[PDB]
Design a binder for these strands. Structure first.
Ligand SMILES: [Mg+2]
Ligand SMILES: [Mg+2]
Ligand SMILES: [Mg+2]
Ligand SMILES: [Mg+2]
Ligand SMILES: [Mg+2]
Ligand SMILES: [Mg+2]
Ligand SMILES: [Mg+2]
Ligand SMILES: [Mg+2]
Ligand SMILES: [Mg+2]
Ligand SMILES: [Mg+2]
Ligand SMILES: [Mg+2]
Ligand SMILES: [Mg+2]
Ligand SMILES: [Mg+2]
Ligand SMILES: [Mg+2]
Ligand SMILES: [Mg+2]
Ligand SMILES: [Mg+2]
Ligand SMILES: [Mg+2]
Ligand SMILES: [Mg+2]
Ligand SMILES: [Mg+2]
Ligand SMILES: [Mg+2]
Ligand SMILES: [Mg+2]
Ligand SMILES: [Mg+2]
Ligand SMILES: [Mg+2]
Ligand SMILES: [Mg+2]
Ligand SMILES: [Mg+2]
Ligand SMILES: [Mg+2]
Ligand SMILES: [Mg+2]
Ligand SMILES: [Mg+2]
Ligand SMILES: [Mg+2]
Ligand SMILES: [Mg+2]
Ligand SMILES: [Mg+2]
Ligand SMILES: [Mg+2]
Ligand SMILES: [Mg+2]
Ligand SMILES: [Mg+2]
Ligand SMILES: [Mg+2]
Ligand SMILES: [Mg+2]
Ligand SMILES: [Mg+2]
Ligand SMILES: [Mg+2]
Ligand SMILES: [Mg+2]
Ligand SMILES: [Mg+2]
Ligand SMILES: [Mg+2]
Ligand SMILES: [Mg+2]
Ligand SMILES: [Mg+2]
Ligand SMILES: [Mg+2]
Ligand SMILES: [Mg+2]
Ligand SMILES: [Mg+2]
Ligand SMILES: [Mg+2]
Ligand SMILES: [Mg+2]
Ligand SMILES: [Mg+2]
Ligand SMILES: [Mg+2]
Ligand SMILES: [Mg+2]
Ligand SMILES: [Mg+2]
Ligand SMILES: [Mg+2]
Ligand SMILES: [Mg+2]
Ligand SMILES: [Mg+2]
Ligand SMILES: [Mg+2]
Ligand SMILES: [Mg+2]
Ligand SMILES: [Mg+2]
Ligand SMILES: [Mg+2]
Ligand SMILES: [Mg+2]
Ligand SMILES: [Mg+2]
Ligand SMILES: [Mg+2]
Ligand SMILES: [Mg+2]
Ligand SMILES: [Mg+2]
Ligand SMILES: [Mg+2]
Ligand SMILES: [Mg+2]
Ligand SMILES: [Mg+2]
Lengths: 93, 56, 135, 75
RNA sequence: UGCCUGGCGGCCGUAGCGCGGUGGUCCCACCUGACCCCAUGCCGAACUCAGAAGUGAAACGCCGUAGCGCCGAUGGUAGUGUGGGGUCUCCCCAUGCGAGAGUAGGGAACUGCCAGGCAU
RNA sequence: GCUCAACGGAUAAAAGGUACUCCGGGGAUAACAGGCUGAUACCGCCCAAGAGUUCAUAUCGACGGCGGUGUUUGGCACCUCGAUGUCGGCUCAUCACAUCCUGGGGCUGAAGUAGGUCCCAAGGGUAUGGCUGUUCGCCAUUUAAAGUGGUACGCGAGCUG
RNA sequence: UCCUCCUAAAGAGUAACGGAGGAGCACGAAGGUUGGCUAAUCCUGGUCGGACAUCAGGAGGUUAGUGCAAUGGCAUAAGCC
RNA sequence: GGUUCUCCCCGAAAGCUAUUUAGGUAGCGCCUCGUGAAUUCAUCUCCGGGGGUAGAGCACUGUUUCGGCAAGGGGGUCAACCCGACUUACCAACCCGAUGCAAACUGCGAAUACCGGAGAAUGUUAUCACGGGAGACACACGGCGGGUGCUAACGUCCGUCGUGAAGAGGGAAACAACCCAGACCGCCAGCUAAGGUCCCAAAGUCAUGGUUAAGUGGGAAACGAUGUGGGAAGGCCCAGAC
């Protein structure tokens, strides 16, 4: 039931992803259903404080992206190799 | 279409492929300003030696 | 100590140690010791840290050793010239990358796990941090 | 020591890659097993060398049920 | 031409296995018999030759089945070509190429030619 | 027709010694010394199972870890073979601090005395003889103490040999 | 000296007193061709029969085989009659 | 060991193979001279390719940890050729589930490289063949990939590239190989790269906002610390927090 503010990320690769992780905003994807996947990017502070408490990996999340709400569920997270940092989050609608 | 390539670094320490690309574009000394066409081939050569040429 | 009881070939290459690790998640237990540095553990260091943390938690609750030494490191002796074959096989190491979880523990409080993994991390050559389970 | 020996390497591999205009009887692939089986006008020799029986262009193909990697010759 | 079956393919697991159901007028399999043509390091099991009473059990084919197998995006990550930097056993930045495993999901094949049967 | 197997096979047929040696050469290649690592050595520091009457840390610290010096035994072959004389003794020394005394302290499982260990400190001082070629050692006897190292294991255009 | 794998950096090559192995042959059938056949192991039962001979059936599908060291191959069999 | 006048053009190698051979030599690779030959050769775009390296994975060869249910071994109330009935909190194989590792593992698999075709531009034919002449076969370090070694050495042995060798100048104080750079000659002319601009010493005691109190900068680890700055989460607190 959390409300996370996202932003639609323009360009994707190794370079823009590492530039986002430098600028404190890890990227993430939303797939699921028959609609297209969507390329979101999130702040790191809010989502690490959310994924501390274990209802984040449990319940229905809600993403404020472009104003329009999206009900979604957290699926598959890649963490950092040797840090308390997040790399990427797979979301399923 | 016709663009202007210019050299900006020198070709002393570089690889055989970069020596060959600079010889094929025809830029001998630094500060050489040559005129070439605009082919995907010439765009690829500028992509290959992007660290020592300067296009306009 | 901790050596493979049978192997195909006696002496192995040196090899580099680059790239990130695999066993990052705390799979079995609840409280894990994650190596943040990069280096080689040995059979001596693994047995020393295991018996240290066993003394620390006073043998209550399960220990898990995750990495096992299976790469033999050889040493030429002293007063021996550089030629004449690869030297005799002395001891066994286990390569560690940044991210490898070495020990896990359950059936202990959190604070006792902190004290135990401190006590056993001070006998290992690689810099390590603490980590807990997640879901 | 006991381990000085090693043989003298027998220059295996592929010689004419796909799309090279082969002459008749030329050697395409030297190998020890039938890594590449023969197809439309390729002859398999004694030591599983593949020699082009007819002129044309070499063209590798992956046919057959067990995904065996045949070699053909066009014209 | 509507379907079913036999043959030779194209294709090579989305095409294979599993579980359940189904078909014998025709076709196919089992079947009946074999001194015989022919066969068995013994045996009509196989191989083969005479045939058509029965059956669709087995086998084969068809149909449902997500229990596997199999395929598999978008994103991310590892890696690496070129140029540059650092704390230089290892990395980082600009750029170009971008895996494997996994995820959503896909998924009980499709097709050509001939011949035969059924009203078609 | 030859394990011509030293396998592109010098002959059909061939082992050694030289400190009595000699010549041509090489620092392309060794011993002493220097250099570059520092595995080992020597001194540190980190974690603390114990021992210490109770007590981890007055004093040692098992199992393990990270260094420092260049300081033993080594590694490499950089310099020197149209030469840099290589152990020890005598005579001169000079430097460093990781101190042996003397100076100042903190702790003590320090009553005093005698101590133990740690920190600062290098101004001075730091043994005579027996045996061996000795450095080293063991021993006898003193001393406040009989320092640890470098300096081409200092020093032979200074000296024995 | 000759052969196989690694070293060897996805064509070939590529070193060391680097890491593991073998040969200096066998065969008048172990070659050619035609025709036929499919293994290792495990389970169950069975006379002497024992963990292991032979026989039936199953599950399994190359986990076997190549006259010989390893590698590449092999079911159309290059394996077995 | 030595080899005696001058100028102009091009300009290597320290590799392979073989050697009573390793410091010599021969053929080839690399150079030069001459002649001939075709878009011959190079760079780039697109196309046709084959691998099995980095990476990854655990179906196979192995190795390994843990959990699940077990044939089979080792403890036995009770008797013991018997039937060992039954077990203790035993070990332990195939299996299954989860976890790692591998140069001599691959049910997967890139980048570059390599080969072949088409295309445009450029390059003093740079490619190929032939013939005359050699030299060289003691290489070194730096970057990446690796094998001895101790992920030691200005160590040794290879692959590829560069520079020295055979190359001056400018920088790193000095300093063949590191960074910029290729010297035909003259000029008391200008622009600039690596690196720098207080003074020695050419050029900013230049502007904007921080951080450091250590001479850190200007040699360094395990580990320790209320040094100080920044972020984010917090748990007690104007009903009284430390
Ligand atoms: Mg990048
Ligand atoms: Mg590697
Ligand atoms: Mg790795
Ligand atoms: Mg019959
Ligand atoms: Mg049926
Ligand atoms: Mg991708
Ligand atoms: Mg993928
Ligand atoms: Mg299906
Ligand atoms: Mg089916
Ligand atoms: Mg002489
Ligand atoms: Mg020399
Ligand atoms: Mg010496
Ligand atoms: Mg040092
Ligand atoms: Mg040491
Ligand atoms: Mg005490
Ligand atoms: Mg102490
Ligand atoms: Mg110790
Ligand atoms: Mg010294
Ligand atoms: Mg030398
Ligand atoms: Mg040398
Ligand atoms: Mg000298
Ligand atoms: Mg000399
Ligand atoms: Mg002289
Ligand atoms: Mg002092
Ligand atoms: Mg005291
Ligand atoms: Mg002094
Ligand atoms: Mg003084
Ligand atoms: Mg001295
Ligand atoms: Mg000395
Ligand atoms: Mg001396
Ligand atoms: Mg000595
Ligand atoms: Mg003397
Ligand atoms: Mg003198
Ligand atoms: Mg004498
Ligand atoms: Mg190769
Ligand atoms: Mg290659
Ligand atoms: Mg046959
Ligand atoms: Mg039986
Ligand atoms: Mg045969
Ligand atoms: Mg020239
Ligand atoms: Mg060169
Ligand atoms: Mg020879
Ligand atoms: Mg000879
Ligand atoms: Mg010689
Ligand atoms: Mg690997
Ligand atoms: Mg491999
Ligand atoms: Mg010539
Ligand atoms: Mg030679
Ligand atoms: Mg040589
Ligand atoms: Mg040499
Ligand atoms: Mg070399
Ligand atoms: Mg090199
Ligand atoms: Mg290297
Ligand atoms: Mg090396
Ligand atoms: Mg060297
Ligand atoms: Mg080196
Ligand atoms: Mg120079
Ligand atoms: Mg200079
Ligand atoms: Mg300097
Ligand atoms: Mg200067
Ligand atoms: Mg010039
Ligand atoms: Mg500048
Ligand atoms: Mg001056
Ligand atoms: Mg000035
Ligand atoms: Mg100012
Ligand atoms: Mg420091
Ligand atoms: Mg109060």
């Amino acid at each position: 039931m959390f409300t996370i503010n996202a932003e639609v990320r323009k360009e994707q690769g190794k370079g823009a992803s590492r530039r986002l992780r430098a600028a404190n905003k890890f990227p993430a994807i939303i797939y699921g259903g028959k609609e297209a996947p969507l390329a979101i990017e999130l702040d790191h502070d809010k989502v690490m404080n959310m994924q501390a408490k274990a209802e984040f990996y449990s319940e229905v999340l809600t993403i404020v992206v472009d104003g329009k709400e999206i009900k979604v569920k957290a699926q598959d997270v890649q963490r950092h190799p040797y840090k308390p940092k997040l790399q990427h989050i797979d979301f399923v609608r | 279409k016709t663009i202007k390539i210019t050299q900006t670094r020198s070709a002393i320490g570089r690889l055989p492929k970069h020596k060959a690309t600079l010889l094929g574009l025809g830029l001998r000394r630094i500060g050489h300003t040559v005129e070439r066409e605009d082919t995907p081939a010439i765009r690829g050569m500028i992509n290959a030696v992007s660290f020592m040429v300067k296009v306009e | 100590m901790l050596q493979p009881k049978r192997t195909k070939f006696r002496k192995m290459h040196k090899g580099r140690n680059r790239g990130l690790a695999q066993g990052t998640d705390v799979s079995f237990g609840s409280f894990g010791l994650k190596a943040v540095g990069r280096g080689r553990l040995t059979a001596r260091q693994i047995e020393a840290a295991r018996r240290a943390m066993t003394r620390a938690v006073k043998r209550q609750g399960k220990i898990w050793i995750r990495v096992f030494p299976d790469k033999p490191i050889t040493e030429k002796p002293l007063a021996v010239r550089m030629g004449k074959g690869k030297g005799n096989v002395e001891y066994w190491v286990a390569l560690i990358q940044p991210g490898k979880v070495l020990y896990e523990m359950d059936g202990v409080p959190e604070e006792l796990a902190r004290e135990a993994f401190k006590l056993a991390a001070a006998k290992l050559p690689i810099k390590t941090t603490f980590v807990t389970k997640t879901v | 020591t006991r381990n000085g020996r090693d043989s003298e390497a027998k220059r295996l591999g592929v010689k004419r890659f796909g799309g090279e205009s082969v002459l008749a009887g030329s050697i395409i692939v030297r190998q020890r097993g039938t890594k590449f089986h023969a197809g439309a006008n390729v002859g398999c020799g004694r030591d599983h060398t593949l020699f082009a029986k007819a002129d044309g262009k070499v063209k590798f193909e992956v046919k057959g049920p067990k995904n065996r990697k045949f070699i053909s010759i066009e014209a």
